[PDB]
């Protein structure tokens, strides 16, 4: 019966006998080749403008990852040097965010797999601080709520997974984020804390912690209710410090007790890297820290994951070391330049409304636009997305949350390796698409599938 043209031998079908555990062994390199070949069906992401996550390859990151394939992060004993490098990073990130100079030399924070993990960790201490304070006073502590904006999905999880009532201030037309006013309306003694999104996923815009900080101070005076903040700087955290160092959002704000960020977003780390830093020893409840015994003393951890590769910490460190402040500033500005240029060029092409023009002071390096209300140029942005996909380009169109469920937007993400010249290409394909849509009016209204929007 069946032969394979690669091997010149009897066929082994990954798609049959994929319902059960395999019975027999297979020659090693044959297994390797079968799998390798089917990976060619994966995209490479170079033409993907939806994703936040690092997609550019650096030959040096590959080597570091490869050496670190078995280095256990949780094993501080066998891999003391990796452990050291980790602790360094914790500090360097702490510093980048203006955390108070730490007491003994070592800042209160931890590496994580991503911002998802950093956030629940952020959330758990937030809930714990609120709880303790609340038992102290002698009041019920069974109904905690969290106040926030158009948060990324992980916050919704935390909410459910931790039994916290989520008051997400709903998106609405010409009022897309958490403003002072609607925040204060959602706060009372049962609020564990307020979570501004420093770099909203859906739109790219910054939520500005400073106006929000003011309203929480006035709140305290008025009601004697003290409220903390946690900044989800999933992408913000490695942009602002460099391209807008005078946006005050970080630890410079006394209410911020912790900040998290994805290193594998604008932090230039490979996939698998996240950070969270607490203001000081006191932001982090001791009941959450578990001290594990090892050979030269005992290190306490607050983390969900246990064993895992230390590869990404080493990489993150390598980016940190090679670039520095000076170097990050050049990288991030390169991207803002591309975003900005795309924003200026895309306005010329249709009747668009910009939620985000890719400006260092308003948000991350991303262009995000919607069709001007009740204007009809002969196509939806879904339709336009589709023509562009026929050109290799993943540019997502979708609907926003809240009360702006109505609105369809397009969002372009300018990450590292999307240089000016590709930008150029995109625009040539972008125009080609308008022209084709123009010449075939029947193409209007047909596509309607929301794309992957969450990272």
Ligand X SMILES: *Cc1c(COP(=O)(O)O)cnc(C)c1O
Of 125, 130, 158, nearest to 144 by C-alpha is 130
Of residues 85 and 148, the one with the C-beta less far from ligand X: 148
- Residues 105-134 binding a copy of itself (CB under 8 A) are 105, 113-117, 120, 124
- Residues 5-64 binding ligand X (CB under 6 A) are 52
- Residues 282-341 binding a copy of itself (CB under 8 A) are 287-288, 290, 292-296, 304-309, 314, 317-318, 320-327, 329-337
Cα separation, 154 vs 352, whole angstroms: 30
With contacts defined by CB under 8 A, name the span among 26-34, 180-188, 343-351, 403-411 that binds a copy of itself: 26-34
Q: Which two tokens stand for residue 59?
A: 């030959």
Q: Report the residue number whose CB is nearest to ligand X.
A: 114
- Residues 237-266 binding a copy of itself (CB under 8 A) are 242-247, 262, 264
Q: Kindly state whether residue 345 participates in binding a copy of itself, applying the rule CB under 8 A.
A: no
Which one of a copy of itself, ligand X, none is in contact with 159 (Cβ closer than 5 to 8 A by kind)?
A: none
- Residues 287-306 binding ligand X (CB under 6 A) are 306
User: Is there a binding annotation on residue 51?
Assistant: yes
Which of 86, 96, 235, 433 is in the footprint of a copy of itself by CB under 8 A?
96
Q: Kindly state whether residue 37 participates in binding a copy of itself, applying the rule CB under 8 A.
A: yes
What's the distance, Cα to Cα, between the start and end of the chain in Å?
46
Q: Which two tokens stand for residue 170?
A: 């709903």
Which one of ligand X, a copy of itself, none is in contact with 55 (Cβ closer than 5 to 8 A by kind)?
A: a copy of itself
Which one of ligand X, a copy of itself, none is in contact with 67 (Cβ closer than 5 to 8 A by kind)?
A: a copy of itself
Of residues 184 and 415, the one with the C-beta less far from a copy of itself: 415
29 φ, ψ (degrees, to nearest 5): -70, -20
Q: Tokens 């929301």 identify what position?
A: 450
Cα 406 to Cα 149, 171, 392, distances in angstroms: 18, 11, 28
Q: Kindly state whether residue 162 participates in binding a copy of itself, applying the rule CB under 8 A.
A: yes
Of residues 73 and 251, the one with the C-beta less far from ligand X: 73
Which of 103, 132, 218, 440 is in the footprint of a copy of itself by CB under 8 A?
440
- Give strand ranges (E) for 285-388: 290-294, 297-301, 352-357, 366-371
* Site track 138-157 with ligand X (rule: CB under 6 A), x = hit: --------------x-x---
C-alpha 295, offset from chain centre: 36
Cα separation, 357 vs 340, whole angstroms: 6
Of 314, 430, 283, 424, nearest to 369 by C-alpha is 430
Cα 167 to Cα 150, 155, 156, 186, 426, distances in angstroms: 10, 11, 10, 7, 39
Cα separation, 131 vs 140, whole angstroms: 9
Please give the helix or strand (H or E) that residue 220 lies within, else none: helix 209-223
- Give the neighbor-by-neighbor strand order of the sheet with 229-232: 109-112, 274-278, 256-262, 229-232, 191-195, 145-148, 165-168
- Residues 350-369 binding a copy of itself (CB under 8 A) are 360-361
* Binding-site ranges for ligand X (CB under 6 A): 52, 114-116, 152, 154, 197, 199, 201, 232, 234-235, 262, 274, 306-307, 455
Which residues belong to the annotated binding site for pyridoxal 5'-phosphate?
115-116, 201, 264
């Amino acid at each position: 019966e069946l032969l394979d043209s690669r091997f010149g031998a009897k066929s082994i079908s990954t798609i049959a006998e994929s319902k059960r555990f395999p019975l027999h062994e297979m020659r090693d390199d044959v297994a390797f080749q079968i799998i390798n070949d089917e990976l060619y069906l994966d995209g490479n992401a170079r033409q993907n403008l939806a994703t936040f996550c690092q997609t550019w390859d650096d030959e040096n990151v590959h080597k570091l990852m490869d050496l670190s394939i078995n280095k256990n992060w949780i094993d501080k004993e066998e891999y003391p040097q990796s452990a050291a490098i980790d602790l360094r990073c914790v500090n360097m990130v702490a510093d980048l965010w203006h955390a108070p100079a730490p007491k003994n030399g070592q800042a209160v924070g931890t590496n994580t797999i991503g911002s998802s993990e950093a956030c629940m960790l952020g959330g758990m201490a937030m809930k714990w601080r609120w709880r303790k304070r609340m038992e102290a006073a002698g009041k019920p502590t069974d109904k905690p709520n969290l106040v926030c904006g158009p948060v990324q999905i992980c916050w919704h999880k935390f909410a459910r997974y931790w039994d916290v009532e989520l008051r997400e201030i709903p998106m609405r037309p010409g009022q897309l984020f958490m403003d002072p006013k609607r925040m204060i309306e959602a706060c009372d003694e049962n609020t564990i804390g307020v979570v501004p999104t420093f770099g909203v996923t859906y739109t790219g815009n910054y939520e500005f912690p400073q106006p929000l900080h003011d309203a929480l101070d006035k709140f305290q005076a008025d009601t004697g209710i003290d409220i903390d903040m946690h900044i989800d700087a999933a992408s913000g955290g490695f942009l602002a410090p460099f391209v807008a160092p005078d946006i005050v959002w970080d630890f410079r704000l006394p209410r911020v007790k912790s900040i998290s960020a994805s290193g594998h977003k604008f932090g230039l780390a490979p996939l698998g890297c996240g950070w969270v830093i607490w203001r000081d020893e006191e932001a982090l409840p001791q009941e959450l820290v578990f001290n594990v015994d090892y050979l030269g003393g005992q290190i306490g951890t607050f983390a969900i994951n246990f064993s895992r590769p230390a590869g990404q910490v080493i990489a993150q460190y390598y980016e940190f070391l090679r670039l520095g402040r000076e170097g990050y500033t050049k990288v991030q500005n390169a991207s803002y330049q591309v975003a900005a240029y795309l924003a200026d060029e895309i306005a010329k092409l249709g009747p668009y409304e910009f939620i985000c023009t890719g400006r260092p002071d308003e948000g991350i390096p991303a262009v995000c636009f919607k069709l001007k209300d009740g204007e009809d140029p002969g196509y939806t942005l879904y339709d336009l997305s589709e023509r562009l996909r026929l050109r290799g380009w993943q540019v997502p169109a979708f609907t926003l949350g809240g009360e702006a469920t109505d609105i369809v937007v397009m969002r372009i993400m300018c990450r590292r390796g999307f240089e000016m010249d590709f930008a150029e290409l995109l625009l040539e394909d972008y125009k080609a698409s308008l022209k084709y849509l123009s010449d075939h009016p029947k193409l209007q209204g047909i596509a309607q599938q929301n794309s992957f929007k969450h990272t």
